[PDB]
Symmetry: D2
Subunit: 25 residues, 4 copies
C-alpha cells in the first residue's frame, strides 16, 4: 500500500512536470 | 503554483519513502 | 533544458519505484 | 540500499525543483 501511494504521488508530480514543460519549454 | 504543486506531490512521495524505511530499514 | 532535466529525474525515480515494486510483488 | 536509493532520487528531484523555483523567483 505505501509503495503504491508513493508511486501515485510521484506520477502526479511527473504529470505536473509535463504540464510545466508544455507551457515553458 | 504548477511548480509548487509538483514540489508538494514530490514531498508526499518522499514522506512515503521514509515511512517504508521506518518499517524495512 | 532544466525543465526536461527535472521531468527526466522524476521519470528516473518512477523507474526505481516500479523496479522495487516488481521485487516486492 | 534500494529504498535509500529511491529516497535519494526523490531528494535529487526536489533539489532541482527548488533550484528552478529560486531562478523563477
Amino acid at each position: 500500500s505505501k509503495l503504491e501511494e508513493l508511486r501515485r504521488k510521484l506520477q502526479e508530480a511527473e504529470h505536473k512536470a509535463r504540464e510545466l514543460q508544455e507551457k515553458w519549454g
